[PDB]
Design a protein around this ligand. Sequence first.
Ligand SMILES: [Cl-]
Lengths: 394, 393
Amino acid sequence: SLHDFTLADVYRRNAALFPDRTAFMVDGVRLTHRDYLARAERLASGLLRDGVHTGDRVAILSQNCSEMIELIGAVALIGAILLPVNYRLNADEIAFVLGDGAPSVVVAGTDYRDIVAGVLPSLGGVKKAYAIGDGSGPFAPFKDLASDTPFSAPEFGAADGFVIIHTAAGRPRGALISQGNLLIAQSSLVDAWRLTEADVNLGMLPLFHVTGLGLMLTLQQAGGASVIAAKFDPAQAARDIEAHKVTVMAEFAPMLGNILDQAAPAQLASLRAVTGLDTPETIERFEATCPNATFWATFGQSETSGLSTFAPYRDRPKSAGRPLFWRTVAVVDAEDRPLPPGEVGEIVLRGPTVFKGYWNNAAATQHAFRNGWHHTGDMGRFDADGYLFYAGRA
Amino acid sequence: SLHDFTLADVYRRNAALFPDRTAFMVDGVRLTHRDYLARAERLASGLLRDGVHTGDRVAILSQNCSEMIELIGAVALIGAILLPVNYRLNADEIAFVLGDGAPSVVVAGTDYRDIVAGVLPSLGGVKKAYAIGDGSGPFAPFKDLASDTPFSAPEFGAADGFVIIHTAAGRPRGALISQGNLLIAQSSLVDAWRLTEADVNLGMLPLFHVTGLGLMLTLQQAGGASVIAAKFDPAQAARDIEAHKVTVMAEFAPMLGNILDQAAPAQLASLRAVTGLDTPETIERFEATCPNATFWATFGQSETSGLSTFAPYRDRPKSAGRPLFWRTVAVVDAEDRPLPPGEVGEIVLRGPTVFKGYWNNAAATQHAFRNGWHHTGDMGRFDADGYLFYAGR
Ligand SMILES: [Cl-]
């Protein structure tokens, strides 16, 4: 414990150093660092009250909202494991994810109270269930979760599981990622983007996804702010960028293209750094429109706690960037021998950004970790300067 | 160790991404990142040949030089523990320090062959003894450490001990610091000073000291370079700042004052960041002379892997700055209850920059770590913005 720094320590840090600064702008309401810690502490006492211990799962099926954001914090404060369910899955897949994760507490969103109610009798040690809105069905209302019992934090470390992120393999496979994985991975983003408490993220990606969750947690570790909305609208995005002076964002095609369509260049003047998956055409268009902004080429996955390689796109167009500090990246042949510059092989990783392993799946983990390298399942090549070029799936 | 990233990984990173950039300038002798790795591996392979295992100590008593810099890397590569001896100590203290660390290899600097040979018969497990430069008496020449056997790294973690730094309790006490402690602590400095591979340190402090070693390793982490000299000369420092385009340095008073005396304002133009310990008079003098440079207020010690608190001096003059990321800093009661802002107490620390504990001194370690906080031995207070003000020992 003495040598640990966790997300709990970030929330307390932000409440101490930047208490009155914005943490979140979410559905028309402002939440400061001081008030975020207070709300998270209340919900954390409630989870403890409900009988959640360190290592237990807390599930949420919900679109991005203030309740989800403060629940993320509450889970972090007691060393529990978040199970954010992908709401673009069908009722069978959701049932699988929930059963695979085995939560002690389930939280249903406004639009998802039905689907969750169907799954709930098939779940074992689920102690309490909540809904955001009101408790129509087997759920209590979410406001019942919070407790006034003064919060006393259980014992846990940064290496303990924090989140299970399922991505479809076949069956969905849950990637267990620690608090420390994320903090250390994201410290490199803070550095590359010169993030400070003045910075502002436009959180348009879902918080169940590694990039969405990761970008929020990144700005939070800088003491900065995220603008979070439930749904993506290109024109609303452009207005948010101007209104809140958004400096950074992550995006997947066609989001940036669609914002560029709907935005006057003058609305986007505060943008400094953008990343994600996009075409050379859109990236070059974006950089043309916004001369003071840089698009950042990247490769990563949930198993690598988000970003692994990163660089300004202009430094090496069509690449995925250079390996970040904390990451040793190689490209190997079928028997894990490192290949020379130019040759295509499997992208492999070592270091503290490698995830803990696959939930409920010793076989998949053993395969991922063969010969002491994490295996991405992705193909690529390095150039002479150590830039990675993504070459597809294996 | 699938999950480990150590100093070894830094060297291999730098050789992969910045092979032809300067890693070091040691009295005009240039070393690139690729060459540094090549040299460190040959020395590490030689350390193994001599029978050094992970966790064994390699001692050095020397002023700053290229041999010492390469040795630090060799030791890092095999998970050994460096014992850099403070050369400003008397023969009794050096004897004590060398005995406390119980090294398996001893390296004597050219000026220190006699002191080290004095202590050598009293040491238990010394497999090999070397001297920097020409071989003399019990010492083989340092050049003999290198081996041509292809380097094969042992298994070790970032959390394993890496260096023992002795500071007086009167009797010297050795802080054991991991590779991980240093990398994580110094990553905050890379971030705060916007260090990239273009940056250049003027390493004027001894490498046995946490600030000196920390700065070298910080610039190395960023892929930058250090200009390192055996001794401090203010006039030479001014020339080096100009010739090598030094962007950053740490300094202890009166070093910066003396440089300012000897430098044309024009020679100091590349400088953008300075930290260390100095008077308000000299700091303001420096910032007046160099308008594009910033002096950074700081507090730290060996037991906190170097710097703990950091901020531009102008943001809160006479403070020690704000706690860095990775540090949980508080000021406490004698009962270890945290004090409200304003109240003077003992500076305490949690987090991954906290050292491993004192070498062979469980009583001192237990006292340092009481109630799950590391205790600095220093008094201070926080203001309402969370700036720390240092208030004595
Ligand atoms: Cl703090």
